[PDB]
Design a protein around this ligand. Structure first.
Ligand SMILES: N#CC1(c2ccccc2)CCN(C(=S)S)CC1
Ligand SMILES: [Zn+2]
Length: 257
């Protein structure tokens, strides 16, 4: 099965998922000097005050913080987006070392990790339908750098011991994802894909320019998770990122000058 090892990693994925070599794959390098300011882009609207988190799951490739998406409770709109996109979950991609871990890069710079807040277009009724559409998802990508602690991340860090291995989940109610956002909502946007199999080309990417800072202790706790199941040889959950893919026939737009 696919993963991030030498024998089943990103360079292998195309064999089971031929779309891996498609025309709008993610992540990509964001060349800041080539991205064009688009004055017609609207400001983002991130409405998370009514978010209802439910559970945290180690799915064997990352951990997902899941939300109740059966009503418009936490939504993303505006920016490049037409309509309303509901928050379903967030997860991260991170490295074994502070110098790698992000999927998107900025002028080839890699960050220590990258947060993906995943939202689906409500005009498609459910997430499974939405991923089959070119405008089905909007993913808000936020870079993490190591420095000062992010206080709003700590509740996530502290539950990881309870979901160390693949398939473990834990109750995770009343978590406020507003505590994971940087001050500025300036962003780059482009059409792309999921960055894990099934690699579906259904994502409007919205990548924030301003990283959040997390502490070395916080990211060290991510790196204590396991890709393996309980009672299996330990394989640390690290370097669960896909490298940058060809930009092909796409332009990255900036919301800012
Ligand atoms: N979990 C999960 C994802 C998934 C998994 C199976 C089918 C469709 C989507 C959605 C969010 N993902 C990205 S934003 S990288 C990871 C893959
Ligand atoms: Zn992701």
């Amino acid at each position: 099965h696919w993963g991030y090892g030498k024998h089943n990693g990103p360079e292998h994925w195309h064999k089971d998922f031929p779309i891996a070599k498609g025309e709008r794959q993610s992540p990509v390098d964001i060349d800041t000097h080539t991205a064009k300011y688009d004055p017609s882009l609207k400001p983002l609207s991130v409405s998370y005050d009514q978010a209802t988190s439910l559970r945290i799951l180690n799915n064997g490739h990352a951990f997902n913080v899941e939300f109740d998406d059966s009503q418009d409770k936490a939504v993303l709109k505006g920016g490049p987006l037409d309509g309303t996109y509901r928050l379903i979950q967030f997860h991260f991609h991170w490295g074994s070392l502070d110098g790698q871990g992000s999927e998107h890069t900025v002028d080839k710079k890699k960050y220590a990790a990258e947060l993906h807040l995943v939202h689906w277009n409500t005009k498609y009724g459910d997430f499974g339908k939405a991923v089959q559409q070119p405008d089905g998802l909007a993913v808000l990508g936020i870079f993490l750098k190591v420095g000062s602690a992010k206080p709003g991340l700590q509740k996530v860090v502290d539950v990881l011991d309870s979901i160390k291995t693949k398939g473990k989940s834990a109750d995770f109610t009343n978590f406020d994802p507003r505590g994971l956002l940087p001050e500025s909502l300036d962003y780059w946007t482009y059409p792309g894909s999921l960055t894990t199999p099934p690699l579906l080309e259904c994502v409007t990417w919205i990548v924030l320019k301003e990283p959040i800072s997390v502490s070395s202790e916080q990211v060290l706790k991510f790196r204590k998770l396991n890709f393996n199941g309980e009672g299996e040889p330990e394989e640390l959950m690290v370097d669960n990122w896909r490298p940058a893919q060809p930009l092909k026939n796409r332009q990255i737009k900036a919301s800012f000058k």
